[PDB]
Symmetry: D2
Subunit: 74 residues, 4 copies
Amino acid sequence: SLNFGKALEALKEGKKVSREGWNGKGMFAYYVPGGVYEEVKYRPYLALKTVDNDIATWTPSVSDILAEDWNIVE
Amino acid sequence: SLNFGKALEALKEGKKVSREGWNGKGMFAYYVPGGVYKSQTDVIKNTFGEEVKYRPYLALKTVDNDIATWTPSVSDILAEDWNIVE
Amino acid sequence: SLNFGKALEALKEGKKVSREGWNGKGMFAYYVPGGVYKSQTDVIKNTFGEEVKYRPYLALKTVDNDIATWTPSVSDILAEDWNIVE
Amino acid sequence: SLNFGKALEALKEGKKVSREGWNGKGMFAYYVPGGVEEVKYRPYLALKTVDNDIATWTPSVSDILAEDWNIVE
C-alpha cells in the first residue's frame, strides 16, 4: 500500500503501478519517456494497459492522486 | 524545487503549493477535506439518497482570483519545480 | 449511444450522462455550476478578497455512492457510447 | 467561437483546433488515429505546445466547457 508519491517514483524508474481500487487486475500504468523524432521533440507522458489489453493515454484523477492503495506490479 | 510527490505531501498537510511559473500569477493549489451533506429535495434523495458523501479534492486559485476544483495535468504531475508557498 | 459533444450539451443542461464502456456500473457525471460566496475570515480576505468566485466543474457519482471531482479521459472524449441517464 | 463538441468533430475529421483563452499563438491540437506479441494502441490527441514540442494531451475541464474554439488552417 503506497501513496501516489512513491508510485510516481516507481513510474519514473520504469516500473509498472496499479491501484487496488481500480477493480481491474491486469491494469497497470507506466511512464513513457520523451524523445526527439526537421526533428520533432515529444514530451513524456503516462500510459495505461487497460482491461481490453490495449494501450491508452492516462491522466490520473484526483482520487488516484489522493489514494494510498498503490502497488508495484511485475 | 520539489517533485509532485513532496508537493502532494504539503497539500495533505494543509499547505499551499505552486509551480515556478505560477508566482506572479497568484496561483496556488490547496487541499479540501471530504464531507457528508444532507439531502433536502426528494429529487436529490431519489438519486443520491438521504445523505451524500463527498470525497476529498483539490482547489486551484487561478489568475482571476477565482477558484477551480482542480485535476492536475500530466505535465504538472511530472514536473519537479514545485514549492511550498506561504 | 451518443458522442461526447451531445453528452456535454446534456451536462450543460443539467442532465446526467454515463458510458457503456465503463467497468464500474451505476456511475454518472453531472455539471456543477459556478458561484460567488462571501468570505468568512480575515485570512481569506487577505489572500482572496471579499468575494470568492468558483468556476463550474464536473462531478462523478462513483460506485461507492461517492462524489468525486471528474476530468474526462481521452478515451471518454473520443467515445461514442454515451447515454443520458434519468 | 465553437464549443468543444464542434472542435471535437473537427478533430475527428483531421483538422487542427485551438482556443482563444489559451492566449498562445501557434498552439494547436490534432487527432492521432489508433493502430497496431503485438500491441494495439487507442486513438488519442496530440498538442503542439508553446515550445514547438508535441505532447499527448488530455483536455482540461475548462477546455471542455470553453466555447472559444476555432479551426486552425
